């Protein structure tokens, strides 16, 4: 009876909108009892089966639906979503393209197709397909919010205010109707949403994990209440899909091996397979135990292994980023679960007990922004492995080509030995900076850069062109190895002016907004002999930024763009800039560590979100309170002063140059000891039985 099965199929659609997925599944199947050949019920059922993570069972029904109706457009589109979640992008494209073939005005299919182009880096095509979907279905929250992020990625500030209005309007309506918001938690930091809306957005994405774990019907775990089974050692589990060539490893790859084995037994749970890099190699060897959970796709079994290792503190290092398997935390295999480092924001979820932060990043007055309890680190929660990865940048030398410290720079492990082979090396006391005069040796190095040569030899020492590290040693270029040659870095390599202030920002473009660019324009107008240095990410955003800078009165030559470089070249070429202008909307957390390691001052204006306060937290730990702006006017004044008071710039540059070593910012050994003290506070608190409480102290 297709008529009764139709009633059940419509009722299931209604229950499906209300979030009652279990009942929707029960109603779709009942419709399939009344009407076995119901192609619509097969497809709708497969959709909710996909929501519950039962992807293989969903595909089976999608194909059953398409066997019944070979021209079922909705089935191909929905099946495409299941294949994309399965990482089969070619299969998803073929499904999406087949659906749009059957129904040229299939708004959902165009939006889904646009998602592939977005994830592929084909932003212009994603924009085109999202606009097509909105042209066919102007009321399309998914297509609008993802289109809004595409425009954010390319810095297209076209009708920005109105676009923000509609975004906030869409989230408020979705939060009011208990629907999953179309704005991603990671992206919410970029839009003028209330802190309540941001946490609510997170809270509902954290609840999605339950839909995938409730069908597992697993009982709660029994957690250890003492350290007797682990010989008095606290068992700490680090879960991350980024144990490899990923920024997170570039920050904390030394921490596992630096844990005190007398008090701690470190477990590293990879959610990703081995990518063959030394980062992965290092963590697998220095951790007491390395568990590749990518081999255990089922969260139930994977959660069992975590609990069966006796973990006391489980650390979430992904949040809502790619590769995250938060379902493992929704099952609570560990008595204490904490967010740390990986994700700049609240989980908004129940299972996460703590979030590891600091007083500067997350002052107590904004406790309402987070679902977790605040667990303060002593200075800053952030950390980087720069001291271990890029030691050749601990010292530098320059070439007096006329004394600048960022026009022609020499770095190397054997730098002093090479300088000791030269008879005319001068020193400028600040650690003091050695200067090479414009002699025969100096002309030889300059000749290499202009001629584009890869490297030369002087007094037996190899002198490498900074632009050609990959051709010399690819391991050195990715930061896997330390470059064994003396590297030359010149402003001339990147078209930077030799006699002008260079304000830089190597952050991704989506972190810039119209207000931020306006600040930078005000700074450039006030410092005439200066230019802005930006990263081509994505390259199609370069023309967008220029046009707006052009509207604000800045010629196109005042904004210099460089391509994305290898890790080592990115961190090393930061030495060429005078100042770093941080992005207030969302701070460059890893980028700030790279810039600070190069001895480049960074100006920042901490906002209210966690992502907007990391830069201020790093400088507070570094000991440079004069680079933290309380409002936009102070942000510009601080930047203009560094570009026009060259004596003040020299003082502030030497301050960062010294304190990057003397302050705890890059001291991973100290950071690990402080993190261990914090871990024990959490366990001592758990030993008493107290519920997770704030560790602000």
């Amino acid at each position: 009876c297709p008529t009764h099965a139709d009633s059940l199929n419509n009722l299931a659609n209604i229950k499906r909108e209300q979030g009652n997925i279990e009942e929707a599944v029960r109603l779709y199947r009942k419709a399939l009892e009344v009407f076995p050949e119901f192609a619509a019920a097969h497809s709708n059922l497969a959709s909710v089966l996909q929501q519950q993570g039962k992807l293989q069972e969903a595909l089976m029904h999608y194909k059953e639906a398409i066997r019944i109706s070979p021209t079922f457009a909705d089935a191909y589109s929905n099946m495409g979503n299941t294949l994309k979640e399965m990482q089969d992008v070619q299969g998803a494209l073929q499904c999406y393209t087949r659906a749009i073939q059957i129904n040229p005005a299939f708004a959902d299919a165009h939006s889904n197709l646009a998602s592939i182009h977005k994830d592929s880096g084909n932003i212009p095509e994603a924009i085109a397909s999202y606009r097509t979907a909105l042209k066919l279905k102007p009321d399309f929250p998914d297509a609008y919010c993802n289109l809004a992020h595409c425009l954010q990625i390319v810095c297209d500030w076209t009708d920005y205010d109105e676009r923000m209005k509609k975004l906030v309007s869409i989230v408020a309506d979705q939060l009011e109707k208990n629907r999953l918001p179309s704005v991603h938690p990671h992206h919410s930091m970029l839009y003028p949403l209330s802190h309540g809306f941001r946490k609510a957005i997170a809270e509902r994405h954290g609840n999605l994990c339950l839909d995938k774990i409730n069908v597992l019907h697993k009982p709660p775990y029994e957690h250890p209440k003492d350290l007797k089974l682990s010989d008095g050692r606290l068992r700490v589990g680090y879960v991350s899909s980024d144990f490899g060539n990923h920024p997170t490893s570039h920050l904390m790859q030394s921490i596992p091996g630096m844990h005190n084995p007398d008090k701690f037994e470190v477990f590293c749970y990879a959610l990703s397979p081995d990518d063959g890099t030394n980062f992965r190699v290092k963590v697998m060897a220095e951790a007491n135990h390395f568990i590749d959970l990518s081999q255990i796709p089922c969260n139930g079994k994977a959660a069992d292994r975590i609990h069966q290792d006796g973990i006391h503190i489980l650390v979430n290092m992904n949040g809502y980023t790619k590769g995250a398997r938060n379902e493992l935390f929704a099952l609570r295999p560990a008595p204490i679960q904490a967010m740390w480092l990986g994700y700049p924001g609240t989980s908004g979820a129940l299972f996460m007990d703590y979030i590891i932060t600091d007083q500067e990043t997350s002052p107590a007055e904004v406790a309402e922004q987070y679902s977790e309890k605040l667990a303060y680190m002593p200075h800053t929660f952030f950390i980087g492995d720069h001291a271990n990865m890029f030691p050749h940048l601990k010292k530098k030398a320059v070439i007096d080509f006329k004394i600048y410290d960022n026009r022609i720079v020499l770095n190397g492990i054997d730098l002093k030995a090479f300088l000791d082979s030269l008879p005319d090396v001068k020193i400028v006391k600040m650690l003091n900076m050695p200067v090479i005069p414009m002699n025969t040796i100096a002309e030889a190095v300059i000749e290499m850069i202009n001629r584009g040569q890869i490297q030369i030899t002087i007094n037996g020492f190899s002198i490498s062109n900074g632009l050609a590290t990959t051709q010399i040693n690819n391991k050195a270029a990715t930061g896997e190895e330390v470059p064994r040659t003396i590297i030359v870095t010149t402003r001339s390599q990147y078209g930077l002016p030799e006699d002008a202030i260079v304000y830089c920002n190597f952050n991704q473009l989506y972190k810039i907004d119209p207000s931020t660019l306006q600040m930078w324009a005000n700074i450039l107008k006030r410092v005439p002999n200066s230019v802005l240095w930006l990263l081509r990410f994505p390259a199609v955003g370069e023309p967008n930024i220029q046009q707006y800078a052009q509207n604000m009165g800045l010629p196109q030559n005042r904004i210099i763009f460089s391509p994305v470089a290898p890790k080592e070249e990115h961190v090393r070429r930061g030495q060429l800039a005078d100042v770093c202008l941080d992005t207030p909307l969302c701070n460059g957390h890893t980028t700030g560590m790279d810039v600070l390691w190069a001895g480049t001052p960074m100006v920042t204006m901490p906002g209210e979100t966690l992502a907007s306060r990391v830069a201020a937290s790093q400088l507070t730990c570094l000991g440079c309170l004069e680079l933290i702006a309380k409002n936009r006017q102070e942000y510009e004044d601080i930047a203009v002063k560094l570009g026009t008071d060259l004596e003040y710039l020299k003082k502030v540059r030497g301050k960062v140059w010294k304190q990057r070593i003397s302050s705890p910012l890059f001291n991973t050994k100290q950071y690990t000891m402080e993190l261990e003290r914090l871990y024990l506070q959490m366990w001592e608190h758990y030993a008493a039985g107290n519920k997770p409480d704030h560790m602000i102290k």
Binding site: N10, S47, D74, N81, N112, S115, D119, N146
Partner: peptide, 10 residues
Amino acid sequence: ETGTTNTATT
């Protein structure tokens, strides 16, 4: 990983 939209057929 951009999200997608499922279609409910009526």
